[PDB]
Amino acid sequence: PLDVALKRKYYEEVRPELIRRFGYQNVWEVPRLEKVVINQGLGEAKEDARILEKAAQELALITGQKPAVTRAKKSISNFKLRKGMPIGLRVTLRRDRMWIFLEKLLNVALPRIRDFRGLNPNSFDGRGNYNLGLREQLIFPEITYDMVDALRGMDIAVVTTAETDEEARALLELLGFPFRK
Template sequence: MAPRLQELYFQTIQSELGKELGIKNVLSIPRIEKISINMGVGEAMQDKKFLELAADAMTEIAGQKPVLTIARQSIAGFRLREGVAIGCKVTLRRDRMYEFLDRLISIVLPRVRDFRGVSRTAFDGNGNYSMGLSEWLVFPELTGDKFAKAQGMNIAIVTSASTDDQARRLLEMFGMPFRAPKVKKTA
């Protein structure tokens, strides 16, 4: 069975977005291509257990095993040596991507403390959206006793949209809770 958001995209969002943007070719309508989750673990240089814990947490969150990221160059100020594992990342596509996006929008973001919506301006100019979470405990898959140490992560949603406005509209149709736009006061 296809994920809920995938069915929503193909049954309603695709046709509505195509009409809204004036795109007749179905393959030209913006869609989500992949979601990348990245976690930098600075404490991994002192103790490898933190990196293993982060990889376990990311496996629970994403549903697939992450790849360890390795430092490309040495930086003396950070006591970092080239070739040392300092984080992990995972790229989600197809079913897992839609399932993760569904959990992110409907379960995780509402659990963030003092949540007022995600930024409307965190686009890169090419229709890709990036956001950060300061704590991984907002994911219900993670139990507080094993994953007690707070760790943040970056989430990048890559779309096929050519502009930020198209990508914002696509994510709005999926239900991404953007903050209300700021209204300029006139004197």
């Protein structure tokens, strides 16, 4: 679907606010938002390669994409880890499917997080992308809670064309990202 409420909210009322604030000679110079990369690192399923495809089934359900699997770069002794094995799932979502996911994340998921006095605002990476991570997977609407065998969280990479943190913050703020200020 090409409609998707947040996409809109970005175009009508997020873009202009940004042009009003920083002020921009070019339509392109104003920050767009590409690539939410979701990544589950799991040493948890290492010797068990079965547990994994459940986690990928879970990730599919909330993303609408099947993740691909990442495999161990080098071999490390101290926690098991032959250089062969699967460490975790990683899904790239952009372009619509991205949007429909961030919407759900803003209006349902984070709200459901126990505590949550808001998203940490130091996680901006200095060139203006943002990262965060979640402890449990059941904070999502598509997860039924009786389909959790074991908790696994993840890492989320919000990538943005904004050259700086400040602008990147502004973009995401205006989209409705709740921040701990």
